[PDB]
Amino acid sequence: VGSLNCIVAVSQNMGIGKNGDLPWPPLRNEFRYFQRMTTTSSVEGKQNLVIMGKKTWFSIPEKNRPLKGRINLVLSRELKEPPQGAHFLSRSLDDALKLTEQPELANKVDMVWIVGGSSVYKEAMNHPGHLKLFVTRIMQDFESDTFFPEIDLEKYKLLPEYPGVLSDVQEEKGIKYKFEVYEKND
Protein backbone atom coordinates (compact mmCIF):
# COMPACT_ATOMS: atom_id res chain seq x y z
CA VAL A 1 0.00 0.00 0.00
CA GLY A 2 1.33 3.52 -0.80
CA SER A 3 1.02 6.76 0.99
CA LEU A 4 -1.52 7.95 3.61
CA ASN A 5 -3.07 11.40 2.92
CA CYS A 6 -5.91 13.59 4.13
CA ILE A 7 -7.67 15.96 1.76
CA VAL A 8 -10.05 18.79 2.80
CA ALA A 9 -11.34 22.17 1.83
CA VAL A 10 -11.66 24.58 4.74
CA SER A 11 -12.88 28.17 5.26
CA GLN A 12 -10.91 30.81 7.15
CA ASN A 13 -12.85 29.97 10.34
CA MET A 14 -11.86 26.29 9.96
CA GLY A 15 -15.31 25.25 8.72
CA ILE A 16 -15.79 22.08 6.64
CA GLY A 17 -19.58 21.46 6.72
CA LYS A 18 -22.96 22.93 7.65
CA ASN A 19 -26.16 20.83 7.93
CA GLY A 20 -24.55 17.95 6.00
CA ASP A 21 -23.39 20.04 3.06
CA LEU A 22 -20.50 22.34 2.38
CA PRO A 23 -20.51 25.84 3.95
CA TRP A 24 -19.93 27.50 0.52
CA PRO A 25 -21.71 27.30 -2.81
CA PRO A 26 -20.47 24.67 -5.21
CA LEU A 27 -16.93 25.35 -6.49
CA ARG A 28 -16.79 23.18 -9.60
CA ASN A 29 -13.06 23.32 -10.26
CA GLU A 30 -12.33 22.78 -6.55
CA PHE A 31 -14.33 19.60 -6.69
CA ARG A 32 -12.56 18.61 -9.90
CA TYR A 33 -9.25 19.02 -7.90
CA PHE A 34 -10.54 16.74 -5.18
CA GLN A 35 -11.61 14.08 -7.72
CA ARG A 36 -8.30 14.31 -9.63
CA MET A 37 -6.11 14.06 -6.47
CA THR A 38 -8.02 11.21 -4.91
CA THR A 39 -8.51 9.20 -8.14
CA THR A 40 -5.02 9.52 -9.78
CA SER A 41 -2.90 6.41 -8.82
CA SER A 42 0.82 6.47 -9.23
CA VAL A 43 0.98 2.59 -9.68
CA GLU A 44 -0.26 0.40 -12.56
CA GLY A 45 -3.11 -2.05 -11.79
CA LYS A 46 -3.94 -0.32 -8.50
CA GLN A 47 -6.77 2.04 -7.38
CA ASN A 48 -6.66 4.47 -4.50
CA LEU A 49 -8.81 3.85 -1.36
CA VAL A 50 -10.96 6.60 0.19
CA ILE A 51 -11.82 6.31 3.86
CA MET A 52 -14.67 8.37 5.27
CA GLY A 53 -17.05 8.47 8.23
CA LYS A 54 -20.67 7.63 7.93
CA LYS A 55 -22.07 11.18 7.81
CA THR A 56 -19.61 12.04 5.07
CA TRP A 57 -20.68 9.08 2.98
CA PHE A 58 -24.32 10.09 3.28
CA SER A 59 -23.40 13.72 2.44
CA ILE A 60 -22.43 12.61 -1.07
CA PRO A 61 -25.46 12.75 -3.43
CA GLU A 62 -26.53 9.24 -4.49
CA LYS A 63 -25.51 10.28 -8.08
CA ASN A 64 -21.87 10.62 -7.02
CA ARG A 65 -21.79 7.64 -4.59
CA PRO A 66 -19.54 5.56 -4.55
CA LEU A 67 -16.74 7.93 -5.60
CA LYS A 68 -15.99 6.39 -9.00
CA GLY A 69 -12.61 4.78 -9.75
CA ARG A 70 -11.72 4.52 -6.05
CA ILE A 71 -12.37 1.82 -3.45
CA ASN A 72 -14.83 3.34 -0.92
CA LEU A 73 -14.54 2.39 2.73
CA VAL A 74 -16.91 3.72 5.36
CA LEU A 75 -16.22 3.94 9.14
CA SER A 76 -19.01 3.13 11.57
CA ARG A 77 -19.68 1.18 14.82
CA GLU A 78 -23.50 1.18 14.26
CA LEU A 79 -23.74 -0.20 10.68
CA LYS A 80 -23.70 -3.95 10.33
CA GLU A 81 -22.53 -3.94 6.70
CA PRO A 82 -21.34 -1.41 4.09
CA PRO A 83 -24.01 1.04 2.99
CA GLN A 84 -25.71 0.67 -0.40
CA GLY A 85 -23.03 1.45 -3.00
CA ALA A 86 -20.05 1.31 -0.57
CA HIS A 87 -17.37 -1.44 -0.74
CA PHE A 88 -16.02 -1.83 2.75
CA LEU A 89 -16.98 -1.12 6.42
CA SER A 90 -14.58 -0.80 9.28
CA ARG A 91 -15.16 -0.01 12.97
CA SER A 92 -12.09 2.15 13.52
CA LEU A 93 -9.42 3.91 11.52
CA ASP A 94 -6.81 1.42 12.79
CA ASP A 95 -9.05 -1.37 11.60
CA ALA A 96 -9.36 0.15 8.20
CA LEU A 97 -5.65 0.63 7.76
CA LYS A 98 -5.05 -3.03 9.04
CA LEU A 99 -7.56 -4.19 6.41
CA THR A 100 -5.58 -2.57 3.64
CA GLU A 101 -2.83 -5.14 4.43
CA GLN A 102 -5.17 -8.24 4.13
CA PRO A 103 -4.99 -10.58 1.05
CA GLU A 104 -8.22 -8.96 -0.24
CA LEU A 105 -6.67 -5.44 -0.52
CA ALA A 106 -2.87 -5.63 -0.16
CA ASN A 107 -2.06 -5.55 -3.89
CA LYS A 108 -5.09 -3.61 -5.09
CA VAL A 109 -4.67 -0.32 -3.06
CA ASP A 110 -2.09 2.44 -4.04
CA MET A 111 -2.73 5.73 -2.05
CA VAL A 112 -5.09 5.96 1.00
CA TRP A 113 -7.08 9.25 1.13
CA ILE A 114 -9.00 10.24 4.30
CA VAL A 115 -11.83 12.42 3.07
CA GLY A 116 -13.48 13.31 6.43
CA GLY A 117 -15.18 14.12 8.67
CA SER A 118 -13.77 15.94 11.64
CA SER A 119 -13.04 12.98 14.03
CA VAL A 120 -11.44 10.87 11.29
CA TYR A 121 -9.22 13.80 10.27
CA LYS A 122 -8.24 14.39 13.93
CA GLU A 123 -7.25 10.75 14.56
CA ALA A 124 -5.31 10.48 11.29
CA MET A 125 -3.47 13.77 11.95
CA ASN A 126 -2.30 12.70 15.43
CA HIS A 127 -1.29 9.20 14.50
CA PRO A 128 2.49 8.72 14.25
CA GLY A 129 4.06 8.15 10.89
CA HIS A 130 4.40 9.71 7.37
CA LEU A 131 1.28 11.66 6.37
CA LYS A 132 0.41 14.53 4.06
CA LEU A 133 -2.52 16.96 4.20
CA PHE A 134 -3.86 18.42 0.98
CA VAL A 135 -5.68 21.53 2.23
CA THR A 136 -7.68 24.01 0.09
CA ARG A 137 -7.86 27.30 1.95
CA ILE A 138 -11.16 28.91 1.11
CA MET A 139 -10.25 32.56 1.87
CA GLN A 140 -13.47 33.85 3.50
CA ASP A 141 -15.47 32.99 6.63
CA PHE A 142 -18.51 30.77 6.16
CA GLU A 143 -21.10 29.72 8.82
CA SER A 144 -20.29 26.13 9.72
CA ASP A 145 -21.32 23.44 12.16
CA THR A 146 -18.37 21.07 11.57
CA PHE A 147 -14.69 22.10 11.66
CA PHE A 148 -11.20 20.92 10.62
CA PRO A 149 -8.89 20.02 13.54
CA GLU A 150 -5.89 22.11 14.44
CA ILE A 151 -2.83 21.60 12.15
CA ASP A 152 0.26 21.53 14.34
CA LEU A 153 2.80 23.33 12.20
CA GLU A 154 5.69 22.17 14.51
CA LYS A 155 5.16 18.78 12.80
CA TYR A 156 3.32 19.61 9.49
CA LYS A 157 5.64 21.43 7.10
CA LEU A 158 3.93 23.50 4.34
CA LEU A 159 5.64 22.43 1.15
CA PRO A 160 6.95 25.17 -1.14
CA GLU A 161 5.79 23.43 -4.34
CA TYR A 162 4.12 20.12 -5.28
CA PRO A 163 3.70 18.62 -8.76
CA GLY A 164 0.25 18.80 -10.09
CA VAL A 165 -0.94 21.41 -7.58
CA LEU A 166 -1.31 24.98 -8.73
CA SER A 167 0.36 27.54 -6.51
CA ASP A 168 -1.55 30.68 -7.40
CA VAL A 169 -4.84 32.05 -6.11
CA GLN A 170 -8.00 30.52 -7.68
CA GLU A 171 -11.42 32.08 -7.82
CA GLU A 172 -14.89 30.68 -8.49
CA LYS A 173 -18.23 32.30 -7.79
CA GLY A 174 -16.43 35.37 -6.40
CA ILE A 175 -14.69 33.12 -3.76
CA LYS A 176 -10.84 33.11 -3.70
CA TYR A 177 -9.08 29.97 -2.55
CA LYS A 178 -5.63 28.36 -2.78
CA PHE A 179 -4.10 24.92 -2.61
CA GLU A 180 -1.54 23.81 0.03
CA VAL A 181 0.24 20.52 0.79
CA TYR A 182 1.61 19.74 4.28
CA GLU A 183 3.83 16.88 5.19
CA LYS A 184 4.78 15.33 8.58
CA ASN A 185 6.92 12.28 9.41
CA ASP A 186 7.05 11.35 13.12
Ligand SMILES: NC(=O)C1=CN([C@@H]2O[C@H](COP(=O)(O)OP(=O)(O)OC[C@H]3O[C@@H](n4cnc5c(N)ncnc54)[C@H](OP(=O)(O)O)[C@@H]3O)[C@@H](O)[C@H]2O)C=CC1
Ligand atom coordinates in the same frame (compact mmCIF):
# COMPACT_ATOMS: atom_id res chain seq x y z
N1 LIG B 1 -13.52 18.98 2.82
C1 LIG B 1 -14.66 19.29 3.28
O1 LIG B 1 -15.09 20.57 3.30
C2 LIG B 1 -15.41 18.15 3.92
C3 LIG B 1 -16.67 18.38 4.40
N2 LIG B 1 -17.32 17.29 5.07
C4 LIG B 1 -18.66 17.66 5.58
O2 LIG B 1 -18.44 17.43 7.08
C5 LIG B 1 -19.80 16.78 7.60
C6 LIG B 1 -19.72 15.23 8.05
O3 LIG B 1 -18.71 15.28 9.01
P1 LIG B 1 -18.78 14.86 10.49
O4 LIG B 1 -20.13 15.47 11.04
O5 LIG B 1 -17.49 15.13 11.11
O6 LIG B 1 -18.89 13.20 10.31
P2 LIG B 1 -18.18 11.81 9.85
O7 LIG B 1 -18.25 11.72 8.45
O8 LIG B 1 -16.90 11.68 10.48
O9 LIG B 1 -19.28 10.78 10.38
C7 LIG B 1 -19.45 10.56 11.78
C8 LIG B 1 -20.02 9.11 11.87
O10 LIG B 1 -18.94 8.18 11.33
C9 LIG B 1 -18.67 7.10 12.13
N3 LIG B 1 -17.26 7.39 12.52
C10 LIG B 1 -16.56 8.58 12.34
N4 LIG B 1 -15.29 8.25 12.74
C11 LIG B 1 -15.15 6.91 13.06
C12 LIG B 1 -14.14 6.04 13.49
N5 LIG B 1 -12.81 6.37 13.69
N6 LIG B 1 -14.51 4.75 13.70
C13 LIG B 1 -15.76 4.32 13.48
N7 LIG B 1 -16.74 5.11 13.14
C14 LIG B 1 -16.45 6.40 12.92
C15 LIG B 1 -19.58 7.29 13.39
O11 LIG B 1 -20.65 6.50 13.04
P3 LIG B 1 -21.42 5.57 14.00
O12 LIG B 1 -22.20 6.36 14.95
O13 LIG B 1 -22.29 4.84 13.08
O14 LIG B 1 -20.45 4.65 14.73
C16 LIG B 1 -19.97 8.80 13.36
O15 LIG B 1 -21.19 9.11 14.12
C17 LIG B 1 -20.77 17.08 6.46
O16 LIG B 1 -21.11 18.50 6.63
C18 LIG B 1 -19.92 16.92 5.15
O17 LIG B 1 -20.44 17.82 4.12
C19 LIG B 1 -16.90 15.92 5.26
C20 LIG B 1 -15.58 15.79 4.78
C21 LIG B 1 -14.83 16.86 4.17
